[PDB]
């Protein structure tokens, strides 16, 4: 019933920066509002409750302000452990409602991808399918274009991609692109190339192999 | 140390029923209000149920008639009995403790690790694990991995060399294939000089199907 809207949806920041995130409610909440942090693949963890109060053990850099409908969370000096998604929660009236979240990622310098290509295994081909995998390792920013080229014929509709969350040590991303073809179509062609374009590279990088 | 530990998830056919459990520790369970919250595949959080210090339950309309929250203050256990399950209930389910004042009208202080629920008509299918073989230039790095293909439901866990190898490992998120089955890749970057002498094995586990696989990745 009560709507919780957050701003920005996502944002990059540098360590030591002062970050402020917003939460807006559709009704007067009387400061019954908590801020939680959830890191990728982990459980939520409460930072602020009652809008202004630090929870047990929460660093002093975290502060909460607001009243009525408009509330805010502020990190005085950003730290590596502060990355993740931040949610707001109203517990003033049932049903308790959560904001959509604000993803907070770490700014860093451009980083070039290491590109690798993997031909399909003999085990798989016996099953009738052929998966060709292109790997981009440790790059920044997230944006990257991966084009498949079978015998210099650009591919479309037959590939999927997956991207990791920001690395803990280098804050880079890694990407996996899989081209799946039937074994019949796979045996019909020779050159399997993966062309990568990314801001850390001066010119696109193409990794390829010949089925023979 | 507050510890909330959930158990009891898994795969359920539509219209079925299942019970979730949350083992509380590190606090006088009886005085604290408790709640169930779930996280959808889109990663949105939805309040599912709450129970006061006086065993009074509270629900949203979406689950009102089907889910029942209960608690056994003797063993320090929170329950979520779900019935008439719908495909829209697929989500990660968390238990959460409330403030020390005992009211359900408080923040969610501590959260459990979460237990996963998938509501599907389909049967569990274990993955096919294929090697992503590395080819090398002296002084360069080589990439190897495992392709974990065609499994349902999530999740699949992957370790390398039974956990001995963690450095440089990237296990990507699962993608839904046009077939309706899931597929993930797990890769590890290693020094080229070590490829002919070091053995690399990915240990793939798919608990929904009780499927363990150990594929040894060799150069080509
Ligand atoms: Cl279904």
Author numbering:
A (entry chain B): 1 to 212
B (entry chain A): 1 to 135, 138 to 222
Question: What's the publication's text?
Answer:
Yellow fever virus (YFV) is a re-emerging flavivirus that causes severe hepatic disease and mortality in humans. Crystallographic studies have resolved the structure of the YFV E protein and shown that its domain architecture is similar to related flaviviruses, with three N-terminal ectodomains, known as domains I (DI), II (DII) and III (DIII) and a stem anchor region known as the transmembrane domain (TM). Here we use a chimeric virus platform to resolve the first high resolution cryo-EM structures of YFV. Stark differences in particle morphology and homogeneity are observed between vaccine and virulent strains of YFV, and these are found to have significant implications on antibody recognition and neutralisation.
5A and 2C9 neutralised all three bYFVs. Next, we carried out symmetry expansion in cisTEM2 to obtain a 4 Å reconstruction of the bYFV17D asymmetric unit (ASU) complexed with Fab 2C9. This 4 Å cryo-EM map of bYFV17D:2C9 was used to build an atomic model of the ASU. We also determined a crystal structure of the free 2C9 Fab, which closely matched the cryo-EM structure.
